[PDB]
Symmetry: T
Subunit: 147 residues, 12 copies
Amino acid sequence: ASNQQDVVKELNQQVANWTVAYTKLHNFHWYVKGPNFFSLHVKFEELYNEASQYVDELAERILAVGGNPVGTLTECLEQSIVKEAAKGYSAEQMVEELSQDFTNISKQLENAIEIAGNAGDDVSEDMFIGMQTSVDKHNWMFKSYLS
Amino acid sequence: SNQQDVVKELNQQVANWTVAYTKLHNFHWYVKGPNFFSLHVKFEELYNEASQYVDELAERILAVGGNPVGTLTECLEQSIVKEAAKGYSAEQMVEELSQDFTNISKQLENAIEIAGNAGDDVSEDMFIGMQTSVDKHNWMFKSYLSLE
Amino acid sequence: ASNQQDVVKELNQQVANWTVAYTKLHNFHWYVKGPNFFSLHVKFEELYNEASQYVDELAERILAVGGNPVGTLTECLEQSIVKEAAKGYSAEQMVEELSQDFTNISKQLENAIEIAGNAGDDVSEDMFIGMQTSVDKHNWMFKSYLSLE
Amino acid sequence: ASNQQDVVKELNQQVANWTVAYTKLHNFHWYVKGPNFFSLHVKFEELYNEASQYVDELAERILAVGGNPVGTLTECLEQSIVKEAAKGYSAEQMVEELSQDFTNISKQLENAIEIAGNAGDDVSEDMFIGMQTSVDKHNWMFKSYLSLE
Amino acid sequence: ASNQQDVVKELNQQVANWTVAYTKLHNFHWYVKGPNFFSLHVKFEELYNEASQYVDELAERILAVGGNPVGTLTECLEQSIVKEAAKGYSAEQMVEELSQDFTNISKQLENAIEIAGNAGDDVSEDMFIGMQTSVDKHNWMFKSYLSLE
Amino acid sequence: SNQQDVVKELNQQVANWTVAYTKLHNFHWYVKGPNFFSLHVKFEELYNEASQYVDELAERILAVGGNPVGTLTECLEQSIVKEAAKGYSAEQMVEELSQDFTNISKQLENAIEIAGNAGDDVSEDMFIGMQTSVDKHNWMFKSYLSLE
Amino acid sequence: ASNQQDVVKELNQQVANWTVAYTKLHNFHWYVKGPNFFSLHVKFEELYNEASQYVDELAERILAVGGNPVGTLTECLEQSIVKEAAKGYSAEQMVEELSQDFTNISKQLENAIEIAGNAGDDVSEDMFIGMQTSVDKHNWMFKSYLS
Amino acid sequence: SNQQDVVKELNQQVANWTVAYTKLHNFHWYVKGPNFFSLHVKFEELYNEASQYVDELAERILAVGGNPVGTLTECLEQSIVKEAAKGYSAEQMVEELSQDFTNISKQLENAIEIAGNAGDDVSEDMFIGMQTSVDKHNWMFKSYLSLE
Amino acid sequence: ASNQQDVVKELNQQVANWTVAYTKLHNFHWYVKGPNFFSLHVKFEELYNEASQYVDELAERILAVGGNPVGTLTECLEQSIVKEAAKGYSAEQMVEELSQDFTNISKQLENAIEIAGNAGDDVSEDMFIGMQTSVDKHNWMFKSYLS
Amino acid sequence: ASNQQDVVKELNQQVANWTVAYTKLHNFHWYVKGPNFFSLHVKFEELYNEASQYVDELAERILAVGGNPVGTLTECLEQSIVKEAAKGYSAEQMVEELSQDFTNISKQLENAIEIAGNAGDDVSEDMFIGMQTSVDKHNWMFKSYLS
Amino acid sequence: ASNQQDVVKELNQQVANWTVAYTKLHNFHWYVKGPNFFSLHVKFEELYNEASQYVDELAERILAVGGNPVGTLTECLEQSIVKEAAKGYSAEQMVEELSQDFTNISKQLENAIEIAGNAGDDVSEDMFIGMQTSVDKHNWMFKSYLS
Amino acid sequence: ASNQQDVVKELNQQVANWTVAYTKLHNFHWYVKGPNFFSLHVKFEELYNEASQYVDELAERILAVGGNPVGTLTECLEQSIVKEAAKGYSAEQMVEELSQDFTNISKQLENAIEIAGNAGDDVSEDMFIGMQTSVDKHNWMFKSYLS
């Protein structure tokens, strides 16, 4: 079975993931090179803007259920399954890594949705579903770019 | 649970928010103190949100062939939200809204279960959307009330 | 010689009328049926949105003159000359009733305007005038919609 | 135990339904006649604009789960439960048919929602819910427009 | 072989028609009655706003070719093929008359277009085309509204 | 004064502004001189304002059960505003508009008194609103005309 | 009885009042301190923006009736019943003073409305009524803040 | 040429663009490669433009007393635009759209002549407007396809 | 008779005219003096903004028919019938010259429209008609300003 | 006597100048007459709105550096090099006076910029530069209007 | 060791400071409590949005001068003089800490401005000035809030 | 020979550069081809719109300091270090040339900034800084596009 604290853990996992992703997306936004610079430069910004929205939405949901949203970078770095950007990525490698991150995040969300549903936290469940919706959509786009 | 059970839950909220709509106007008008400007506006944002819920849930009832409660007398009879009493401080207004939102969120948890079991996933989704906002506002109310 | 208190009474009478009308308009907005559904469904919403504006305007004026705006539905139902919706109304019957309500309100406003002016409350007087302007305009539209042929 | 493939089938069923409906709504938008012309002419456009949004949303979800969205009109006509417009429909008959279509679609969506949930595709499930919400709402309006008196 | 002067005559004919129509549309906008009041009340306003745009466009074109735009109501009433509103028109009769006016104007425009082109005034020709486009479109809507059943 | 007396005053303005609407178009088209750009636009702003008055006052007449003048022939018969003559300088156009606005403002002062005495406070308010704009524009016209 | 010149005097009294109030509101906007700084800082700006609108509206009405709007600070300082801001006001004292100013102005307006009406200047009368409407509304808010 | 000949030309385009509307959705969904983001959006802009043409030309047919093709079966029977096949590269999608636009522009040149000769200057103007956009887009397609 | 290349020549003639006019309008926008400075200063900007739109519209039409739009100032200066601005123009002289330029351009457009129509290039024909529409309208305004 | 205090002095000089100018511009806005009425009437309003922006910006900067922004009309009239409007100007005289005021202000700003830079108050220096940019631009327009 | 490299160092110091501040401001935005909740909750969001703008602006300037913008949270935490949020602050303590951070940042900016100017990097200098302008303005507000 | 006249020289150099660039950017906007057509086609338009803004801003500043802004294409071609477009470039070559132009312009601006500052023309200096900021930013993007 699952309880409210289990959902808070799932919520914080995402706050952590997207806080790290927010910076990695800035890194990619700044360092991307090649013929597709203009498209990707903007696409990465659209993505980190969406990431910041998710961070705030999930963090305030944690507050709404009486929990503590991870509020330090040190904590986010410890929990996040999204790793910081290495050095020297080509445009292709950046999209490939983001695609893997989104694949991993979507998988975590499938589990988070089940946990929330079983805990009776339908609000958090709905938030995870909305996030998975956009994550899966963007991932399809990444894979198409890479095809 | 069946469709009529869900209609009962939908009307329960139409009633709650119709009463809350006027109570929020009351608080909007009578609020006093150094936080007057912030709360005067906050209460208006809340009653605008309340009117949206009333129309949304009422039209969902219509969409499933039911009759939305359309008189104040009926809303007063079904609402778990009380009308404003006489004389409140800003602190007391936010405390009461917190009580109301806590009560409504609890009622919604059950409504969600009933809608889901009846196969009314649309109404279920509407209740979830409402509970989302209700819980968010409640956190804000409790934060405002915290002793500094 | 009317006084401020007399004006507050007139202001609350309208707060009550429009609070009741606000919900009656939702009722008509939801229950209207027939070939004119789309137009009326929308028109009734425009009307209750306008009703809410009146309720707030007049209530805050009462506050501006040191009075107490009626803050409960129970009190509104007691003072309102606008009665709650009954069951089984056709679109035509809904418009007919709103027209009668608007005719009644406009008449009350004529008296309220006189009272406010006599009391020297020119601000409340102006608010009643603004309301009567819209009420009469809408009533002409209702009567036109209801005209035979 | 439904699987992803079963959900894609449900998603394409709707892509097909709404692609056909998109054109049927243009037909009604163009051929509607009578005293309610102005309201219906516009309402039908709002409906096909909404239909186009559904087609794209569901098609891109199918892509997001690795499937193939039906990309031809021929295929859509084959799967769609929504049939093309016939000749000589009055405004009332148009609304009656759309109501029947919406009733049929809502029923299909109830099943699609169950399939998606059982398969663990909560995103597609949510999309079907959103669609059913609007379909049911519009249907209530159609039925109200069609009500006698 | 038409000349610029012939085109100015065609331009003023329309300035006159639409100036008269501008007021006739206000009349219909004010006097329309019946269950279609809300839709028609608005439609007639959209039409006179469009009429005002035509009057200014064509008048300033006449200026652009060195001519004199008819600048008085008396002159407009003299040239206009659009007659002023009579009393006691039902909504249906109003739409019927506007349809006849639009049919008459479209026919005049067909000739005006030919005259402009023959005179080498391709700008005025284009303006007449734009006007005929809208006139014909509106006329189809009027005729659809008027269709029986 | 009674309601019909007020309707007469309302129609008087519907007539005035319907004629002024076309005269302003005339001035809008025929204005010439170094101030062409400013006046060409100013006259358009004025006729747009004129159309608003016509519709507002006409619908007030409808709201009191009267018949708004709906033909140009009738407007020409009741208007105290003359149609544009042939040949004006920019200075002459503004001078005539000033004359018209002065005349209308005077007519409105009486209309306001009539409406008030008849108990038609709504029409009175509409006349006041119009007089407000009319007087403001007239000051601007006179300023433009002042010798530098 | 009252005449047009009497109304012009009433109009100029307000142009003067609000010209001085415009600056006092800036002073309060700049010097307000305390926990309510953010709300009051903005509220005072909204008020001086409204004040500037009144100054222009009433001044141009004076022009419309053939009068001369007070156009110098020296003149406004001589006529205004609104006094310039002292030094060291607390947030509470600022609202208290504005409330007194609005009370005084509303009282002047009641008289100005009567004067204008008796002079047959219904346009100016209407302008005074519109001003009194907002002045009374804001005063209610000030008193509520102070309650 | 007569009015019915023009209606035939108008319906030919309603058919073409109704099929193109769905093919553009197809390309919008299936496009892949490093230019995915630019083309994904470009194709959407194109189908939105396509829907505008369909409604415009269909209502022109109505305006001349004709019957606009209102079923997919009829559009497929009259369209010179083929439905998307299975499997395209980004380059192949743009190449096919270029072929379609070249074909449509040629068809429009004739439609324009027919409309003009029939005295249907309104339909002629609509065809010209469409050809304007079609030719502009085609230049862009060819530019995208140029070997670097 | 006329062919597609003849139309391209007409299109380039206008691209050239308006490219030169764009700069002359800036010159007038900057150097205009006198009591009407504010009106003309803005009017000239509105005109060069419209000029830039025409340049792009006609140039891309040339591309659409397979031609080469004049893309250098040297070429535009060689083809343009609009001459660069002299020195010391009064406001009146500026409007007078623009009026003459518009008269000349409208005359060229009448011929360009005939050429395009005879070549079967109805799209280009329509573009010339739209340009002549605005050119004639603006010229009427110039003449009225000068009357 | 400190450098920063000298900068505050320069900031207050401008708060004073523009507070007085704010009212003088209303005066000109109301009393301007002649064939250029419509243009100047609006131009003067655009100028006082701009002036109000300066007063607030500079006043709050003074606050940002721990100083006291002049918050009374009495004080402003004492420090301002901009004098109140005299009686009955012609439109030409109004523009001539504003041009002289702008010339005087720009000269003061040149000094203020050097004082701010010398004191290391680069923020205030930047604000003075921004003001001088607009002042000089408007002055060029005034001179052009005056021929 | 070059002057331009010293400027990049100054630019990265700020990218680091604001990246950390971005998250600390989210923390305060989420955890703030008390009667001033509504005002501070929004104020802190306005501040982190502003912070995100700085990070991108400065990061891309570093790129414009051929440098490497710090693109990892790990790096930012090392260089930032802004420390992560501690446990359970009162609203007053949150504002007090931000005020100290802003005071520290403004002091760093004063130096960065001189370094940039000395290196002839006037673009970076201007960016630092822009940042200092807002930082100082916000700090004045924080201090006013704290009395 | 005066310092201010040297600044006018620097201002005109840029008015000339950007007037020529305005047309070269239209050329590239029209003739660009290849898979990056859509991105570059729009990017080049954004650049010429920006260029038009510079020409007007700098031209009117020259006017603000009593100078004569170059108002003829003939003059611009003579002073501009930006050369007109050659025949048939590849997309890559277009970006390479713009990058070199931007590098050359930025270098000129560095000098112009020092000249303006030395002459005490801080307004012109600020304008040059603003231009250099955008030029350098665009150049970083061009270089990134080129790998």
